[PDB]
């Protein structure tokens, strides 16, 4: 009966059976809708495209992320990608499987109660559970202590975790993520003349960001090497055939994580928020959090991130203690693995929220 | 009850029953009128000749195209060739058959409303439909995506079409066609001394254009081979018996499609308008339009057109992507086939505009 | 009431009832007047002889053609032969019969208005019509298309006629005819010593021309055969009893139709005027005129004319097309037949010009 | 060295030195040839007469226009009148003077290349130029913008001209001219009985046309005044002594320019061709062409032409804008003046085609 | 020495001295080039026309905007209109005056560096400055806070501005402007049959748009009044003389600013982009931006725009707060005034970029 693990982040749905190594259905969380009223006969009609099909037809469709910063914005578009996820990639009636869902910490109470009420009533699930992302990534590391920085498409979190337990007062969320970085790469890219206005083109630039962009050890050094453009300008090719050449834009896009002042936000960079999170923790356990800080999420995949983190957190923290940062390959897969182990565990099966139980239990019990 | 498909282009009426392979009545759209008041008794009188009969008696008649650039100029001459088409070639009362009519895109609203009001009130049709030409040619190709270049006698169109839908903002019409090319061949032919002033002679030159003329891969190369006149001068024989010899005029007539500056029009050639049409399309779908661009119409029949298109569109488009041009034999037949399939389809029968419905519906509903 | 058909050409009046096969009264159009004041008692006096009676007494009378080149020269001499035609050969009061009259094309407006005013006022005709000669000959051929060459005694015409209608701008008249040929045969005959000065003798030579003269296929060939006079000299016998012997004069008289330079006229021969008439016609219909050119009139009766026409028109026209010349026996009868059929037709009876109507209608309506 | 300006139109050669006010040698373009082989001793012999001498002896000669509709028909007759023009009226060796020649627009390429090859090789000219007629007439008006209607003996043109430049696609040629009008006046005159068959008589009728004929403001009004023949019948006297009386024929001859259907041509009248020429022009410049339309040529000399043009073009053009027609006295002189100014100009002397240069340059460079 | 203010927008150059009230030279930014190779002598030649002269001769010339969407497309055509602006309207050597230039926000770095390098090197300017358009319009309002919507011919901007400072992350550019609206008015106008294909005619329709078009308070209401065409159809007169009658097209052209889906663009209308711009701003200052939103540019001149903005922004924003829109007459003049005041200010004279300084400073300093 094993179990279903659905990681519902902004940008990507990572779903699959528990106890496995990698999610089997990994497709973007979009509901495309035809922009031009196809005045033809037979076309589709396919009033709504979802996921990969919508991706294939980007030029026709208006792409619409149903989930913004972890918050569910549109509730039937979410339903759409869930139904599509259960019957056209996983091929699985939810009635045979308990379902472990995912969500960001410090998230409105409207996401856990409406989410369970849909899973339970529209789909029929024997039992379900909603888990905080960073704890699952810690299971995937195979560790019980550490401070997780999970930066996905919607949200970046810091969740300090000591020997099991948690520290809710030190959990720090920050809306800086791949979606904010791809928009900033939009208006920074347009100073070269390349205009990407539409949602379909936004996912093209998302592609440029995934391949070319990198986090400088020192951005000023990168700027210096860039002035005489030797290796910093690279040629990327669109699907149309044109040639984009991006130099300093390659690295100054991800610099936004460490200098949110480029987007016009006062929030400290992700190194002062992980540092500030360790500050709020009790003086005893900070040495273990400094040593064990973990990384997860697609927005942790920029080459050079871990090294810049080690330079900057080692500059804010007292130099007498060792700051080891553990950033394993397969991060996106790693987050899923931690959730799967918990479903595997012979001690978590008591914590499922039964569907029959849930209606009596109400929203509050789940939270 | 099957259906009637009437392709009303300038120059040729292609009409016949739906579900068939080729139109059965293919005759020129002309209403000849005696030029010299035959001062004889018994002759005709045949105050009006139409189609093939008018063609046979060109020397007596003033030939008058009722439709200029897709726009209906004279409305009872149009009625004349319709009545003639229904009772003397198709032999068919329009009351038994729904009628699919044709028209060019981006055409004045006076053609669809006056056309349906005639079909409905003068003839009596149970139901009818007016369809955009390029979409029918795409059905005839047996394809759902591509950019159609339909060059007939009145008008040349570019209609980009992606996966069903359409892109109205990228539809580009251009008044360059067999009628404009036959007039340019008129005044270019007269530099050899052959004077064709009359409308009857215009259709002779239309005949010369159909047989001899060809589109150079490189016109300058053709000019060079022409200076020493080896194969470029060919002998054509009129119906009178005289011998015309045309050299570079054979190829420089159709060069007007790619260099409209020979007629004194600023519009770009048909390769910059198909290129410009693909430009206005969203960056995602342009690779499919480059690969799938389709051709239709009598003015696509000049030998050498497809190859010149591939040289010129491959010179404007980024050389990294494949520009395949599909130009099947039987183009003139092909346009008709796409319309017939739609009548055949078990999903288009809902879209007919009932005659009774039309009067209540008004002009606007049809459009 | 059937109808009266009067063909009033120079030289011969061909009159009779409509619907018949041949004119019944065929007599020359002359008004003889005694030259020597017969100083006898009882003789005649017959102050005026007309037609056959005048012919019988040629030696006494001055013969006077009332109609020269189609133009009516003397109007009471014309009246004389009309009155004689109606009461002494046709025996018929014109009041019972509508009368179809004849005239050459491109003829002064004084002949149609004075002619109708006489028919109407001096004779009393219920209704009448004046028709162009060549169209009547075309009816007699039983055909609707062709180019008629009608050469009578006064005038030679070319009237191109396509499918009914006419081509007035291509009608070409030329004053070369039996009267001009008989005068040229006069002064060419006098080089043998035979002097014919008088009008009575002119009609003798007209007789010699009708029997002996012939149109050479090649006149130079005829001249060569003539130098050694074997078959080219023939013996003709006058009414007096003397013997005339004419050799090359037999054929060089009708050569004037093809070489008007023998009479001192610049006009091209009748083969360049039929060729030039087909030139002025629209390029489409010329192949039918080349194939269908018709012949009529007494001056088409010279043996050898049709063959010489075919050699000469085939030498001026492009050799790629077939020039058939149709010259049926019974030409003189043939012209009459075409007019009779029109009177017979159940559609021409509307076109009669009523005598009562004519006075109100005036000269202009008739034309 | 000043220059030679030779205006070689059909019917008249207007030649003289540049910078002058009027051409000095103005004589008809004819090569007379004796029709009757003068069997006398001493006469001439003058195997060929040319120009004025041929005119004096019209009764002996066959007159032969060497140039028909602008096209050179016979090339040594043309040479004849050129040689005669250079040595017996201008008295001038062409080797001292560059020669500006004239020709109609849209004229076969055989006239510019054979014309220059003769000027260059038979005569010896240092340099020469061939100019389009209507542009020279525009120089004579002293203006840079306007639409020229030049109607000479062979051809009528419309050449729209805006601010300098030209509009080749709007140039409209039409074979209606004094030669076509004098032939139509031939067969219309013959309905009064006056038969003019010969070429010598054609130039008599050309004289009648020049003096008496006039263009009605309204031809129907002229017809009404003519029915009661008060001022419309005028007496003209031939050189023989006979008296011709022509009424409505006076005005209905030039009506052919506005109703080409009298000659059997489909071409629109000269007011619909000047109107149609302004149509083909870009919407911006049409108001200047309507206001500035110019007139030139001998066939513009009929009294009443300008007023009829203003009534008819003002009836076809939107009545909201002013149609001024400028038709200055001295038209025939005016065309010559525009060419002379260009030779005078200190900027056209670069555009001469050197004789030495021409042989290397070939026919194509001149065109 | 006062100063030069050159507002280089697409469509219009507004230039003049600082401290004045209105720009003195206001002429369109076009470089006309003769389309038909004027085969005349003396004409121009004027190989290039610029501004008003090019406008006068639209029918001859190909008009070519050198600046598209704020981006400089052709750099010597730009140079052309600058040189023309400095010596033939302002009459002023740039060496005596520092020059304040204009540009749109979020514009490629190729426009500020190439623009200064030309101003500095081709012209010689002591010092110069390039300023963001919307800030100058705010100076012209005489205010320090507000959100500027500047819609010109190339680009529409929203620039929120609080108490001096700026908010770069909230600046929102959108390529919808008079050029896009005049093209849409092109293909919408052609459904009435009026075909405007050429660039010269595009500026005619630009004229029609400027006078007749208006922004409906409710477009559906306008459509209803239009069905019974009482006041919605107005008669406009071209320069040719023809009469255009435009009904619903008058208002549905500018509806494109609020419904970009008519051109096939996904971008929200200008009321959702000004609303979305205020969203991105910090919660504190939004009440002042709602109250103070300013308007500038030629595309803000459609009658009815401000009222429609107030209905639509008041429908998106919480109804508890006052949305005052300030749209003063003289907008086009207003933008210039704000720039002139800054030149006038005794505190901006330090911010000039010296020409000598600029070469050392490089492109980056200017930006
Ligand atoms: N290789 C990469 N390099 C940089 N950024 C990436 C890469 N892959 C994905 N991203 C960014 O990270 C996001 C995916 O992260 P993910 O962990 O799937 O987020 P979530 O789990 O919230 O859906 C994408 O939106 C993309 O912008
Ligand atoms: N074999 C040919 N080669 C070149 N041109 C042709 C040929 N056949 C027809 N045309 C031109 O194309 C026109 C016919 O095209 P068609 O597709 O029938 O136009 P429509 O559908 O608008 O009537 C004719 O007017 C002729 O000028
Ligand atoms: N058998 C003949 N051979 C040659 N010429 C003839 C013959 N018969 C008649 N002609 C000539 O033709 C004339 C008669 O032709 P006809 O058709 O009667 O002319 P019309 O109809 O004008 O009177 C006579 O004047 C005579 O000169
Ligand atoms: N006064 C006149 N009135 C009417 N027609 C005239 C007059 N003078 C000349 N023409 C006609 O115009 C012709 C002369 O025109 P012209 O301008 O010399 O032609 P081109 O320049 O082609 O030789 C003559 O053939 C004559 O028929
Ligand atoms: N009265 C008007 N009504 C509507 N639109 C106008 C009017 N005047 C100008 N426009 C449009 O605005 C444009 C001029 O705006 P402008 O502020 O000069 O733009 P820019 O400053 O970018 O040159 C023109 O291209 C025209 O299309
Ligand atoms: Mg995540
Ligand atoms: Mg077609
Ligand atoms: Mg006869
Ligand atoms: Mg002339
Ligand atoms: Mg502006």
From Swiss-Prot, chains A, B, C, D, E:
UniProt GO cellular component terms: actin filament; cell body; cytoplasm; filopodium; lamellipodium; stress fiber; striated muscle thin filament
State its location(s): Cytoplasm, Cytoskeleton
**Listed Pfam families:** Actin
Query: So what does this thing catalyse?
Result: ATP + H2O = ADP + phosphate + H(+)
N6-methyllysine modification sites? Answer: 80
Q: Which residues carry this modification: Tele-methylhistidine?
A: 69
Protein name, please?
Actin, alpha skeletal muscle
- What is the organism of origin for this protein? Sus scrofa
């Amino acid at each position: 009966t094993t179990a279903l693990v659905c990681d519902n982040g902004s940008g990507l749905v990572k779903a699959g059976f528990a106890g496995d190594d990698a999610p089997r259905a990994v497709f973007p969380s979009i509901v495309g809708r035809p922009r031009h009223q196809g005045v033809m006969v037979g076309m589709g009609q396919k009033d709504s495209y979802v996921g990969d099909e919508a991706q294939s037809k980007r030029g026709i469709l208006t792409l619409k992320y149903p989930i913004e910063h972890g918050i569910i914005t549109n509730w039937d578009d979410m339903e759409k990608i869930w139904h599509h996820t259960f019957y056209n990639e996983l091929r699985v009636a939810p009635e045979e499987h308990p379902t472990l869902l995912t969500e960001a910490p410090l998230n409105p109470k409207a996401n856990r109660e409406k989410m369970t009420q849909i899973m339970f009533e529209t789909f029929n699930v024997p039992a379900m559970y909603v888990a905080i992302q960073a704890v699952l990534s810690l299971y995937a590391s195979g560790r019980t202590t550490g401070i997780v920085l999970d930066s996905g498409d919607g949200v970046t979190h810091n969740v300090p975790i000591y020997e099991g337990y948690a520290l809710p007062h030190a959990i720090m969320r920050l809306d800086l993520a791949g979606r904010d970085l791809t928009d900033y790469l939009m208006k920074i890219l347009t100073e070269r003349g390349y205009s990407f206005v539409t949602t379909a083109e936004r996912e093209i630039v998302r592609d440029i960001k995934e391949k070319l962009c990198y986090v400088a050890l020192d951005f000023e050094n990168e700027m210096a090497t860039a002035a005489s453009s030797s290796s910093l300008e690279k040629s990327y090719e669109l699907p149309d055939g044109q040639v984009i050449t991006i130099g300093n834009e390659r690295f100054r896009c991800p610099e936004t994580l460490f200098q949110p002042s480029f987007i016009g936000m006062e929030s400290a960079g992700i190194h002062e928020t992980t540092y500030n999170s360790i500050m709020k923790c009790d003086i005893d356990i900070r040495k273990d959090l400094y040593a064990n800080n973990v990384l997860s999420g697609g927005t942790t995949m920029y080459p050079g991130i871990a090294d810049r983190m080690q330079k900057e957190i080692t500059a804010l923290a007292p130099s007498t203690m060792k700051i080891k940062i553990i950033a394993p390959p397969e991060r996106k897969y790693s987050v899923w693995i931690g959730g799967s182990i918990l479903a595997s565990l012979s001690t978590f099966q008591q914590m499922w929220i039964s569907k029959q139980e849930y209606d009596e239990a109400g929203p509050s019990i789940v939270h």
